[PDB]
Design a protein around this ligand. Sequence first.
Ligand SMILES: N[C@@H](CCC(=O)N[C@@H](CS)C(=O)NCC(=O)O)C(=O)O
Ligand SMILES: N[C@@H](CCC(=O)N[C@@H](CS)C(=O)NCC(=O)O)C(=O)O
Lengths: 208, 208
Amino acid sequence: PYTVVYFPVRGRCAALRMLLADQGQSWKEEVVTVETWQEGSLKASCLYGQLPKFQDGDLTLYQSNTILRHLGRTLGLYGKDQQEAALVDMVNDGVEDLRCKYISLIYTNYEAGKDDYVKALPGQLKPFETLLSQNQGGKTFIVVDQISFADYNLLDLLLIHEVLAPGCLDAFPLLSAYVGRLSARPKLKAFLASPEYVNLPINGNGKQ
Amino acid sequence: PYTVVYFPVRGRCAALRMLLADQGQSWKEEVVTVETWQEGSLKASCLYGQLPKFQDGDLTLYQSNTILRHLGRTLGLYGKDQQEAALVDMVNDGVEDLRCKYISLIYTNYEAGKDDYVKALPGQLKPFETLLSQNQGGKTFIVVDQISFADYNLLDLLLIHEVLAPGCLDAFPLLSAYVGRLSARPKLKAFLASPEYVNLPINGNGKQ
Ligand SMILES: N[C@@H](CCC(=O)N[C@@H](CS)C(=O)NCC(=O)O)C(=O)O
Ligand SMILES: N[C@@H](CCC(=O)N[C@@H](CS)C(=O)NCC(=O)O)C(=O)O
């Protein structure tokens, strides 16, 4: 039913994969090697010439966040009403912004900018700690009483930053208990421990 | 009912403003000067320390695309069903990606990178021409049979690029007729000609 076409890395597919796994959904991984990509055919066929590419039946989607919102809508991980939907988006857009900065660091200037980035990290993470503190004392999910696609995206963002800068969550008790709690969810826990996840690099240039 | 808190520029609020105007909605513009911003209070109160800030009743939102999707949901500019909603997102995410590149050029290296950017423009615009060609011959809207929040965002993206690189749409007949057509919509036409729009700079550093 579901098919994700992507390079052999976690990157922009980690979140949607966690979502599918934690939601007990089944999907096909179509791995695209750098050689196959350099060939040019596939790329030229991609709407924006990039991956991931997602297939739900004959519905073909591009853009990682479009995929997340699509699954969020179809799997009921988008809040209970319009107001909640807006809050979920607000969280996901914030996650996306930080992911872009992370991606820029990793691929553009890991060596030179890693110091400043880590220094500015606390200020970038604080918003999510604040969101949690304003939602049932940070005991449930990021913004509503049920898990949303934004939670999976946030969870990944947090996991990869703990690798980039160990202990970055030590200053944020809600985020820490949040990561621990969500990572404990049965299907998600099993997935995160699987080779399918563990044996794929976070990024494509060996940096993390 | 609606209130947009932003700097005195079109920037990331141009699209939502066109949407509100074309939809016959009323809103309050709360202008934030650079001096008021440098003061720090407001910024510290912003979820991600940035503007725009949007208020719909006591619902406070941040993130321009969250605002667009919120209005799209509440005003019925998000398609008719889930599949269409996904297609609308796919378009908006593409617009967002190019906007980010545009924003980087304008604020990061207008002088040095303007040449390469313009050179790469055609390849960045082509995806939208393609989207139009696959939707009722490009006679209606960007992806579905009704206007969506993504249309307004795309329209703005196109308008500002024609300023950055005059004639960039000459190679794309569907996009051209698209811009002309949407700009002709009564309420939108009146808005675009108003001082409210015309007398605000596109960006904040005087570059365009
Ligand atoms: N906004 C897109 C970004 C997609 C993207 O950056 N794709 C990269 C891999 S992470 C890619 O296809 N790189 C190869 C290329 O551009 O040819 C999304 O969120 O899906
Ligand atoms: N992802 C955000 C980006 C917001 C943004 O870049 N805001 C700028 C002005 S357009 C800002 O607040 N700059 C001041 C600062 O960050 O200190 C959105 O789409 O709204």
